[PDB]
Amino acid sequence: GLTRALVARHALGRAEAYDAALLDVAQDHLLYLLSQTVQFGDNRLVFKGGTSLRKCRLGNVGRFSTDLDFSAPDDEVVLEVCELIDGARVGGFEFGVQSTRGDGRHWQLRVRHTELGEPRIVASVEFARRPLALPSELLAFIQLPIHKAYGFGLPTLPVVAEAEACAEKLARYRRVALARDLYDLNHFASRTIDEPLVRRLWVLKVWGDVVDDRRGTRPLRVEDVLAARSEHDFQPDSIGVLTRPVAMAAWEARVRKRFAFLTDLDADEQRWAACDERHRREVENALAVLRS
């Protein structure tokens, strides 16, 4: 099935993107392995982040994405997944994971294909502990030409709800400016957005990020996202490898304009934006109303 010429075409003929394309294919193989062995589902294991956007919503219209992110509240589930990945073979690919930190939830991924070799691109797997707020959406992979060469059919996987994926992207964007996040937000800006829900979830995600994960600063201010940023304010992180063209100024302008609705925080959101522990019960209740 797979050949260097097929992977090069998957990279749109761009030599600099060959390794990202090989990793993209390897990720599909890893996700297939997981789907055959591990139970996915709400409050157990949900595929999320920019790579879920690539695999299950954008396909070829989106960038390559080098991380695999999951929501997995239970440490035992994380370990099951990591033991399965490490040393696994799926056809021509062999996988390995190395822990990057002591919590067992962040890993460097290495992949090697018997014929096509090992892509020299940074790849990772990360497992979030905090439960997702919304039920997952069971999605097929967007069909791409190279998938015809795999020799198996790709699975359907529970994926983070689109409103929650956008809120998570905005929550990180509020703390640190990453070109890959800007790219993804530029896609969300071209799609239907459930504005009150995205804004509500954004505030609740930042509250947990600050109060519980001690990430970022308090209080949350809408200018954290909506102030004009220059291309020099963003971390590039090889965005030019993952997509072409890179249009940092066009993306920044479209994102800043489209997300103006985040300014319309209601009275509760403005209170919670303080990121104060005293509001924990109110925040838990606000998340609870969205579960049902």
CSV table of C-alpha atoms in Angstrom, one decimal:
chain,number,residue,atom,x,y,z
A,1,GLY,CA,0.0,0.0,0.0
A,2,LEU,CA,2.1,2.9,1.3
A,3,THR,CA,5.1,4.3,-0.6
A,4,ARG,CA,7.3,7.3,-0.4
A,5,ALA,CA,5.5,8.7,-3.5
A,6,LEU,CA,2.1,8.5,-1.8
A,7,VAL,CA,3.4,10.1,1.4
A,8,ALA,CA,5.0,12.9,-0.7
A,9,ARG,CA,1.7,13.5,-2.5
A,10,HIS,CA,-0.1,13.6,0.9
A,11,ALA,CA,2.4,16.4,1.7
A,12,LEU,CA,1.2,18.2,-1.5
A,13,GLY,CA,4.7,17.6,-3.0
A,14,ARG,CA,6.3,19.8,-0.4
A,15,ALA,CA,9.7,18.2,0.6
A,16,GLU,CA,9.7,20.1,3.9
A,17,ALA,CA,6.3,18.6,4.9
A,18,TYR,CA,7.2,15.0,4.1
A,19,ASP,CA,7.9,14.2,7.7
A,20,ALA,CA,4.7,15.8,8.9
A,21,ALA,CA,2.8,13.8,6.3
A,22,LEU,CA,4.4,10.6,7.4
A,23,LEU,CA,3.5,11.4,11.0
A,24,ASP,CA,0.0,12.2,10.0
A,25,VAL,CA,-0.3,8.7,8.4
A,26,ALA,CA,1.4,7.1,11.5
A,27,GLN,CA,-1.2,8.8,13.8
A,28,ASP,CA,-4.0,7.3,11.8
A,29,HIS,CA,-2.4,3.9,12.3
A,30,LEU,CA,-2.0,4.5,16.1
A,31,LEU,CA,-5.6,5.7,16.4
A,32,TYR,CA,-6.8,2.5,14.6
A,33,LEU,CA,-4.8,0.4,17.1
A,34,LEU,CA,-6.4,2.2,20.0
A,35,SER,CA,-9.9,1.8,18.5
A,36,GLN,CA,-9.4,-1.9,18.3
A,37,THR,CA,-8.2,-2.3,21.9
A,38,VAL,CA,-9.3,0.5,24.3
A,39,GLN,CA,-12.8,1.6,25.2
A,40,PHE,CA,-13.4,5.3,24.2
A,41,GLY,CA,-16.3,7.3,25.5
A,42,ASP,CA,-17.5,10.2,27.6
A,43,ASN,CA,-15.7,10.4,31.0
A,44,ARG,CA,-13.3,7.7,29.9
A,45,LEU,CA,-11.3,8.6,26.7
A,46,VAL,CA,-12.2,11.3,24.2
A,47,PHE,CA,-10.0,12.5,21.3
A,48,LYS,CA,-9.6,16.3,21.4
A,49,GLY,CA,-7.3,19.1,20.4
A,50,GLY,CA,-6.0,20.4,17.0
A,51,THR,CA,-5.4,16.9,15.7
A,52,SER,CA,-9.0,15.8,16.3
A,53,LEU,CA,-9.9,18.9,14.3
A,54,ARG,CA,-7.6,17.7,11.5
A,55,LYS,CA,-8.7,14.0,11.5
A,56,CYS,CA,-12.4,14.3,12.0
A,57,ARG,CA,-13.5,17.8,10.9
A,58,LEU,CA,-11.1,19.4,8.4
A,59,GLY,CA,-9.0,16.7,6.8
A,60,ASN,CA,-7.1,18.2,3.8
A,61,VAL,CA,-8.5,21.7,4.3
A,62,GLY,CA,-6.6,21.8,7.6
A,63,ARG,CA,-2.9,21.8,8.6
A,64,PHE,CA,-1.0,18.8,9.7
A,65,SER,CA,-0.9,18.5,13.5
A,66,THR,CA,1.8,16.7,15.5
A,67,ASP,CA,0.2,16.1,18.9
A,68,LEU,CA,-2.3,13.6,20.1
A,69,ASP,CA,-4.5,15.0,22.9
A,70,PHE,CA,-7.1,13.0,24.8
A,71,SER,CA,-9.4,13.7,27.8
A,72,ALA,CA,-8.8,10.8,30.2
A,73,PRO,CA,-9.7,11.6,33.8
A,74,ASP,CA,-8.6,8.2,35.2
A,75,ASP,CA,-4.8,7.5,35.6
A,76,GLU,CA,-5.5,3.8,35.0
A,77,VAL,CA,-6.9,4.6,31.5
A,78,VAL,CA,-3.9,6.7,30.7
A,79,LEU,CA,-1.5,3.9,31.6
A,80,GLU,CA,-3.5,1.4,29.6
A,81,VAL,CA,-3.2,3.6,26.5
A,82,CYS,CA,0.5,4.3,27.0
A,83,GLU,CA,1.4,0.6,27.6
A,84,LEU,CA,-0.5,-0.2,24.4
A,85,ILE,CA,1.2,2.4,22.3
A,86,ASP,CA,4.7,1.8,23.6
A,87,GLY,CA,6.4,-0.9,21.4
A,88,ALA,CA,3.3,-1.4,19.3
A,89,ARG,CA,3.4,-2.2,15.6
A,90,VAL,CA,0.6,-1.5,13.2
A,91,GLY,CA,1.6,-2.8,9.8
A,92,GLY,CA,4.8,-1.0,8.8
A,93,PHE,CA,4.8,1.4,11.7
A,94,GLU,CA,6.4,0.9,15.1
A,95,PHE,CA,5.6,3.3,18.0
A,96,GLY,CA,7.3,4.3,21.2
A,97,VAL,CA,6.4,6.8,23.9
A,98,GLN,CA,8.8,8.4,26.4
A,99,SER,CA,7.5,10.3,29.4
A,100,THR,CA,8.4,14.0,29.5
A,101,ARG,CA,7.2,14.6,33.1
A,102,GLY,CA,6.5,12.8,36.3
A,103,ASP,CA,2.7,12.9,36.1
A,104,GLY,CA,2.4,10.1,33.5
A,105,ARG,CA,0.3,12.3,31.3
A,106,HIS,CA,2.7,13.8,28.8
A,107,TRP,CA,4.8,11.8,26.3
A,108,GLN,CA,7.1,12.2,23.4
A,109,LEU,CA,5.9,10.0,20.5
A,110,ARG,CA,8.4,8.4,18.1
A,111,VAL,CA,7.3,6.5,15.0
A,112,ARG,CA,9.4,4.5,12.6
A,113,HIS,CA,8.3,2.8,9.4
A,114,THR,CA,10.1,-0.2,8.1
A,115,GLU,CA,10.6,1.3,4.6
A,116,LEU,CA,9.8,5.0,5.0
A,117,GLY,CA,11.9,5.5,8.1
A,118,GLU,CA,11.5,7.8,11.1
A,119,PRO,CA,10.1,11.3,10.7
A,120,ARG,CA,12.4,13.8,12.4
A,121,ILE,CA,9.5,16.0,13.7
A,122,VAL,CA,8.5,16.6,17.3
A,123,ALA,CA,5.4,14.6,18.2
A,124,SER,CA,3.6,14.1,21.5
A,125,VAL,CA,0.7,12.5,23.3
A,126,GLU,CA,-1.0,14.3,26.2
A,127,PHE,CA,-3.9,13.2,28.5
A,128,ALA,CA,-5.9,15.9,30.2
A,129,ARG,CA,-7.3,15.1,33.7
A,130,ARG,CA,-10.2,17.6,33.9
A,131,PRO,CA,-13.4,16.1,32.6
A,132,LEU,CA,-14.9,17.6,29.4
A,133,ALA,CA,-18.0,19.7,29.9
A,134,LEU,CA,-20.0,18.5,26.9
A,135,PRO,CA,-20.8,15.1,25.5
A,136,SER,CA,-18.5,13.9,22.8
A,137,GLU,CA,-19.4,13.6,19.1
A,138,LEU,CA,-18.8,10.2,17.5
A,139,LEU,CA,-17.0,11.1,14.2
A,140,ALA,CA,-15.6,9.3,11.2
A,141,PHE,CA,-12.2,10.4,9.8
A,142,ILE,CA,-12.5,12.8,6.9
A,143,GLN,CA,-11.7,10.6,3.9
A,144,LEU,CA,-8.4,11.4,2.2
A,145,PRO,CA,-6.8,9.7,-0.8
A,146,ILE,CA,-3.9,8.1,1.0
A,147,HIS,CA,-6.3,6.3,3.3
A,148,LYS,CA,-7.1,3.9,0.4
A,149,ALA,CA,-3.6,2.5,0.8
A,150,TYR,CA,-3.9,1.5,4.5
A,151,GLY,CA,-5.4,-1.9,4.2
A,152,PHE,CA,-7.9,-1.3,7.1
A,153,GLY,CA,-10.8,1.0,7.5
A,154,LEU,CA,-10.4,4.0,9.9
A,155,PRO,CA,-12.5,3.9,13.1
A,156,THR,CA,-15.2,6.2,14.4
A,157,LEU,CA,-14.0,8.0,17.5
A,158,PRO,CA,-15.7,10.1,20.2
A,159,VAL,CA,-14.3,13.6,19.7
A,160,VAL,CA,-14.6,16.8,21.7
A,161,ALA,CA,-17.7,18.8,20.8
A,162,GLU,CA,-16.9,21.7,18.5
A,163,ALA,CA,-18.0,24.4,20.9
A,164,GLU,CA,-15.8,22.9,23.6
A,165,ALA,CA,-12.8,22.6,21.2
A,166,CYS,CA,-13.1,26.3,20.3
A,167,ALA,CA,-13.4,27.2,24.0
A,168,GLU,CA,-10.3,25.2,24.8
A,169,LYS,CA,-8.3,26.9,22.0
A,170,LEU,CA,-9.4,30.3,23.3
A,171,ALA,CA,-8.4,29.3,26.8
A,172,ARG,CA,-4.9,28.6,25.8
A,173,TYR,CA,-4.7,31.6,23.4
A,174,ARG,CA,-5.6,33.7,26.4
A,175,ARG,CA,-2.4,32.5,28.2
A,176,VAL,CA,0.1,32.1,25.4
A,177,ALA,CA,0.1,33.0,21.7
A,178,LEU,CA,0.8,30.0,19.5
A,179,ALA,CA,0.7,30.1,15.7
A,180,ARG,CA,-0.9,26.6,15.6
A,181,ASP,CA,-3.7,27.8,17.8
A,182,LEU,CA,-4.1,30.9,15.7
A,183,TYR,CA,-4.4,28.7,12.6
A,184,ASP,CA,-7.1,26.6,14.2
A,185,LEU,CA,-9.0,29.6,15.5
A,186,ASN,CA,-9.0,30.9,12.0
A,187,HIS,CA,-10.8,27.8,10.9
A,188,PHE,CA,-13.3,28.0,13.7
A,189,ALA,CA,-13.9,31.6,12.6
A,190,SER,CA,-15.0,30.3,9.2
A,191,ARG,CA,-17.5,27.8,10.7
A,192,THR,CA,-20.8,28.1,12.6
A,193,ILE,CA,-20.1,29.2,16.2
A,194,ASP,CA,-22.5,28.8,19.1
A,195,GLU,CA,-21.4,32.1,20.5
A,196,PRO,CA,-23.0,32.1,24.0
A,197,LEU,CA,-21.9,28.5,24.6
A,198,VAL,CA,-18.3,29.1,23.4
A,199,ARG,CA,-18.1,32.2,25.5
A,200,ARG,CA,-19.5,30.5,28.6
A,201,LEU,CA,-17.3,27.5,28.2
A,202,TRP,CA,-14.2,29.8,27.6
A,203,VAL,CA,-14.7,31.5,31.0
A,204,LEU,CA,-15.3,28.2,32.8
A,205,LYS,CA,-12.2,26.6,31.2
A,206,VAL,CA,-10.0,29.6,32.1
A,207,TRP,CA,-11.3,29.5,35.7
A,208,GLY,CA,-10.1,25.9,36.0
A,209,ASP,CA,-6.8,26.6,34.2
A,210,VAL,CA,-6.0,29.5,36.6
A,211,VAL,CA,-7.5,28.3,39.9
A,212,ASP,CA,-6.8,24.6,39.7
A,213,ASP,CA,-3.9,24.3,37.2
A,214,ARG,CA,-2.2,27.6,38.2
A,215,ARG,CA,-1.7,28.4,34.5
A,216,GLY,CA,-1.8,32.0,33.4
A,217,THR,CA,-2.7,35.0,35.6
A,218,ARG,CA,-5.8,36.4,37.2
A,219,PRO,CA,-8.2,38.0,36.4
A,220,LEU,CA,-9.4,37.0,33.0
A,221,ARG,CA,-9.7,40.0,30.7
A,222,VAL,CA,-11.2,39.9,27.3
A,223,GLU,CA,-8.3,41.9,26.0
A,224,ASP,CA,-6.1,38.8,26.8
A,225,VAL,CA,-7.6,37.5,23.5
A,226,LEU,CA,-8.9,40.5,21.7
A,227,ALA,CA,-6.0,42.9,21.9
A,228,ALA,CA,-4.2,43.3,18.6
A,229,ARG,CA,-1.3,40.9,18.4
A,230,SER,CA,1.6,41.1,16.0
A,231,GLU,CA,3.1,38.1,14.2
A,232,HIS,CA,6.1,38.6,16.5
A,233,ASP,CA,3.8,38.0,19.5
A,234,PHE,CA,3.2,34.3,18.4
A,235,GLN,CA,5.4,31.2,18.8
A,236,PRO,CA,5.8,29.8,15.2
A,237,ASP,CA,6.4,26.2,16.2
A,238,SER,CA,7.1,25.1,12.7
A,239,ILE,CA,3.7,26.3,11.4
A,240,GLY,CA,5.2,26.6,7.9
A,241,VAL,CA,6.0,22.9,7.9
A,242,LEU,CA,2.4,22.1,8.7
A,243,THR,CA,0.6,24.3,6.3
A,244,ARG,CA,1.1,26.6,3.3
A,245,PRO,CA,0.7,29.5,3.0
A,246,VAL,CA,1.4,31.0,6.4
A,247,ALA,CA,-0.7,34.2,6.7
A,248,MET,CA,-0.1,35.3,10.3
A,249,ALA,CA,-1.5,38.8,9.8
A,250,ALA,CA,-4.6,37.7,7.9
A,251,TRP,CA,-5.4,35.0,10.5
A,252,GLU,CA,-4.8,37.4,13.5
A,253,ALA,CA,-7.2,39.9,11.9
A,254,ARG,CA,-9.9,37.4,11.1
A,255,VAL,CA,-9.7,35.8,14.6
A,256,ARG,CA,-9.7,39.1,16.5
A,257,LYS,CA,-12.8,40.3,14.5
A,258,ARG,CA,-14.8,37.1,14.6
A,259,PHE,CA,-14.3,36.6,18.4
A,260,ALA,CA,-15.5,40.1,19.3
A,261,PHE,CA,-18.6,38.4,20.9
A,262,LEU,CA,-16.3,37.3,23.8
A,263,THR,CA,-16.6,40.9,25.0
A,264,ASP,CA,-20.3,40.4,25.8
A,265,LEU,CA,-19.7,38.6,29.1
A,266,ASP,CA,-22.8,38.4,31.2
A,267,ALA,CA,-23.0,39.3,34.9
A,268,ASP,CA,-22.1,35.7,36.0
A,269,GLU,CA,-19.2,35.4,33.5
A,270,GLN,CA,-17.8,38.8,34.7
A,271,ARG,CA,-17.8,37.6,38.3
A,272,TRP,CA,-16.2,34.2,37.4
A,273,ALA,CA,-13.5,36.0,35.4
A,274,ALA,CA,-11.9,37.0,38.7
A,275,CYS,CA,-10.6,33.3,38.9
A,276,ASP,CA,-11.4,33.3,42.6
A,277,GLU,CA,-11.7,30.0,44.5
A,278,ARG,CA,-14.8,31.3,46.3
A,279,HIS,CA,-16.8,30.8,43.1
A,280,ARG,CA,-16.0,27.1,42.8
A,281,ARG,CA,-19.6,26.0,43.6
A,282,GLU,CA,-21.1,28.5,41.1
A,283,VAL,CA,-18.6,27.2,38.5
A,284,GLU,CA,-19.4,23.6,39.2
A,285,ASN,CA,-23.1,24.4,38.9
A,286,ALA,CA,-22.5,26.3,35.6
A,287,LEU,CA,-20.7,23.2,34.2
A,288,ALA,CA,-23.5,20.9,35.6
A,289,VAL,CA,-26.2,22.8,33.7
A,290,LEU,CA,-24.3,22.0,30.5
A,291,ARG,CA,-23.8,18.3,31.2
A,292,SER,CA,-27.6,17.7,31.0
